[PDB]
Design an enzyme around this catalytic site. Sequence first.
Site, PDB file in Angstrom:
ATOM      1  N   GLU A  23      -6.134 -11.813  10.104  1.00  5.19           N
ATOM      2  CA  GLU A  23      -6.187 -11.049  11.419  1.00  5.19           C
ATOM      3  C   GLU A  23      -6.683  -9.608  10.945  1.00  5.19           C
ATOM      4  O   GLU A  23      -5.934  -8.871  10.414  1.00  5.19           O
ATOM      5  CB  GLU A  23      -5.103 -10.830  12.371  1.00  5.19           C
ATOM      6  CG  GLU A  23      -5.088 -10.190  13.415  1.00  5.19           C
ATOM      7  CD  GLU A  23      -3.556 -10.400  14.101  1.00  5.19           C
ATOM      8  OE1 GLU A  23      -2.638 -11.005  13.812  1.00  5.19           O
ATOM      9  OE2 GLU A  23      -3.360  -9.392  14.808  1.00  5.19           O
ATOM     10  N   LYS A  32      -9.164  -9.998   2.344  1.00  7.72           N
ATOM     11  CA  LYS A  32      -8.414  -9.671   1.383  1.00  7.72           C
ATOM     12  C   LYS A  32      -8.635 -10.227  -0.023  1.00  7.72           C
ATOM     13  O   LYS A  32      -8.665 -11.354  -0.322  1.00  7.72           O
ATOM     14  CB  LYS A  32      -6.782  -9.721   1.621  1.00  7.72           C
ATOM     15  CG  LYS A  32      -6.082  -9.385   0.517  1.00  7.72           C
ATOM     16  CD  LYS A  32      -4.310  -9.427   0.712  1.00  7.72           C
ATOM     17  CE  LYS A  32      -3.511  -9.008  -0.229  1.00  7.72           C
ATOM     18  NZ  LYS A  32      -2.033  -8.929   0.245  1.00  7.72           N
ATOM     19  N   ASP A  79       9.604  -6.206   1.412  1.00  5.20           N
ATOM     20  CA  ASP A  79       8.806  -5.053   0.967  1.00  5.20           C
ATOM     21  C   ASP A  79       8.117  -4.273   2.135  1.00  5.20           C
ATOM     22  O   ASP A  79       6.824  -4.163   2.422  1.00  5.20           O
ATOM     23  CB  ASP A  79       7.501  -5.673   0.086  1.00  5.20           C
ATOM     24  CG  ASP A  79       6.609  -4.608  -0.575  1.00  5.20           C
ATOM     25  OD1 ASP A  79       7.073  -3.495  -0.825  1.00  5.20           O
ATOM     26  OD2 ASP A  79       5.241  -5.126  -0.915  1.00  5.20           O
ATOM     27  N   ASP A  84       1.557  -8.037   4.554  1.00 14.72           N
ATOM     28  CA  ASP A  84       1.850  -7.984   3.142  1.00 14.72           C
ATOM     29  C   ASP A  84       3.068  -9.060   2.738  1.00 14.72           C
ATOM     30  O   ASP A  84       4.055  -8.488   2.308  1.00 14.72           O
ATOM     31  CB  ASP A  84       1.751  -6.973   2.374  1.00 14.72           C
ATOM     32  CG  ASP A  84       1.487  -6.992   0.895  1.00 14.72           C
ATOM     33  OD1 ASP A  84       1.739  -8.000   0.390  1.00 14.72           O
ATOM     34  OD2 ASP A  84       1.738  -5.940   0.246  1.00 14.72           O
TER      35      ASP A  84
HETATM   36  N1  LIG Z   1      -5.580  -7.147   8.396  1.00 13.20           N
HETATM   37  C1  LIG Z   1      -5.956  -5.825   7.966  1.00 13.20           C
HETATM   38  N2  LIG Z   1      -6.505  -4.885   8.875  1.00 13.20           N
HETATM   39  C2  LIG Z   1      -6.686  -3.712   8.363  1.00 13.20           C
HETATM   40  N3  LIG Z   1      -6.474  -3.070   7.377  1.00 13.20           N
HETATM   41  C3  LIG Z   1      -5.683  -3.830   6.466  1.00 13.20           C
HETATM   42  C4  LIG Z   1      -5.403  -5.260   6.606  1.00 13.20           C
HETATM   43  N4  LIG Z   1      -4.903  -5.698   5.558  1.00 13.20           N
HETATM   44  C5  LIG Z   1      -4.688  -4.656   4.805  1.00 13.20           C
HETATM   45  N5  LIG Z   1      -5.142  -3.587   5.160  1.00 13.20           N
HETATM   46  C6  LIG Z   1      -5.289  -2.262   4.389  1.00 13.20           C
HETATM   47  O1  LIG Z   1      -5.356  -2.839   3.094  1.00 13.20           O
HETATM   48  C7  LIG Z   1      -4.185  -2.325   2.326  1.00 13.20           C
HETATM   49  C8  LIG Z   1      -3.763  -3.190   1.282  1.00 13.20           C
HETATM   50  O2  LIG Z   1      -3.250  -4.677   1.916  1.00 13.20           O
HETATM   51  P1  LIG Z   1      -2.181  -5.336   1.307  1.00 13.20           P
HETATM   52  O3  LIG Z   1      -2.397  -6.893   2.024  1.00 13.20           O
HETATM   53  O4  LIG Z   1      -0.778  -4.689   1.874  1.00 13.20           O
HETATM   54  O5  LIG Z   1      -2.528  -5.562  -0.095  1.00 13.20           O
HETATM   55  P2  LIG Z   1      -1.472  -5.418  -1.510  1.00 13.20           P
HETATM   56  O6  LIG Z   1      -0.708  -6.813  -1.290  1.00 13.20           O
HETATM   57  O7  LIG Z   1      -2.361  -5.377  -2.792  1.00 13.20           O
HETATM   58  O8  LIG Z   1      -0.402  -4.386  -1.100  1.00 13.20           O
HETATM   59  C9  LIG Z   1      -3.120  -2.053   3.541  1.00 13.20           C
HETATM   60  O9  LIG Z   1      -2.313  -1.078   3.002  1.00 13.20           O
HETATM   61  C10 LIG Z   1      -4.158  -1.456   4.399  1.00 13.20           C
HETATM   62  O10 LIG Z   1      -4.366  -0.227   4.535  1.00 13.20           O
HETATM   63 MG   LIG Z   2       0.981  -7.752  -2.027  1.00 13.38          MG
HETATM   64 MG   LIG Z   3       0.632  -3.987   0.516  1.00 14.46          MG
END
Ligand SMILES: Nc1ncnc2c1ncn2[C@@H]1O[C@H](COP(=O)(O)OP(=O)(O)O)[C@@H](O)[C@H]1O
Ligand SMILES: [Mg+2]
Ligand SMILES: [Mg+2]
Length: 265
Positions: free
Chosen positions: A85, A36, A130, A148
Amino acid sequence: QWALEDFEIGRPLGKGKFGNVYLAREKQSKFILALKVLFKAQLEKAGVEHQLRREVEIQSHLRHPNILRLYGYFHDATRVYLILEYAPLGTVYRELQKLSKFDEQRTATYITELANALSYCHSKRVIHRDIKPENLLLGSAGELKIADFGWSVHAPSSRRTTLAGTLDYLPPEMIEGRMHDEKVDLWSLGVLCYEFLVGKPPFEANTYQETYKRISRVEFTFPDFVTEGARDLISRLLKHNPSQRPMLREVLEHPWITANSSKPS
Ligand SMILES: Nc1ncnc2c1ncn2[C@@H]1O[C@H](COP(=O)(O)OP(=O)(O)O)[C@@H](O)[C@H]1O
Ligand SMILES: [Mg+2]
Ligand SMILES: [Mg+2]
Ligand SMILES: COc1ccccc1C1CCN(C(=O)C2CCC2)CC1
């Protein structure tokens, strides 16, 4: 410790407000994971360094099958990288777009998995705040995982950060900037159950202003196909008064949940 050099980067997994997430593989072990990526200039501008720290601290220490693991982090003067993960079956959000609506068995199973993970969180007075479909991911056996944790805190709490996007999953106390605790996640649980069965959230509207009004007044109705059991659980979770919302054990033991879920507590 870890740096960018240790990973081969692959396809985009998804995008968030700050998050840009990529499939990646660690070079020496060939371990597959998700990276991320966050831009420092954007984090500083919005002033959410505290949220970033919280996400790392909370998610790295929690251990539960229905909660996504965070392994570590690093940074490099333009960017911060969180090591997560990898969830191979995507988001609940994408699955809802695919099928339009879930059946009662799928809905009840997701709710059980969510309630198990939240029960574990709340036992440390951790509240997520959230819970929504784009933050619920699916493992290799199709099991739900909460992700998240950037908005999470310890209860009780006020709010110091500006609400960004949609109001659809937030309780009245939260949108009115009042004081709140654990019961916020149970409200969100009720919003989810409805959206899983119906295909859209119960307070959805065309404007921010009208959505706010429908939430503070708790104005929702059920389509004909929603059964009496589902209506009972949902009506119990969507209470204006936080203290009247059920305990998570009551959700896990609700007759509609036990009759339809394929997983235990
Ligand atoms: N560990 C993961 N495995 C697969 N897809 C992921 C993972 N983490 C995030 N994603 C994808 O990326 C998007 C954004 O991640 P997130 O951590 O929710 O970001 P933000 O903090 O900007 O909301 C998620 O909605 C999902 O589509
Ligand atoms: Mg976030
Ligand atoms: Mg998110
Ligand atoms: C314990 O500190 C952290 C834990 C998890 C993630 C990040 C940090 C630190 C604080 C945030 N930061 C930065 O460069 C800031 C983000 C704008 C510049 C990286 C180092």
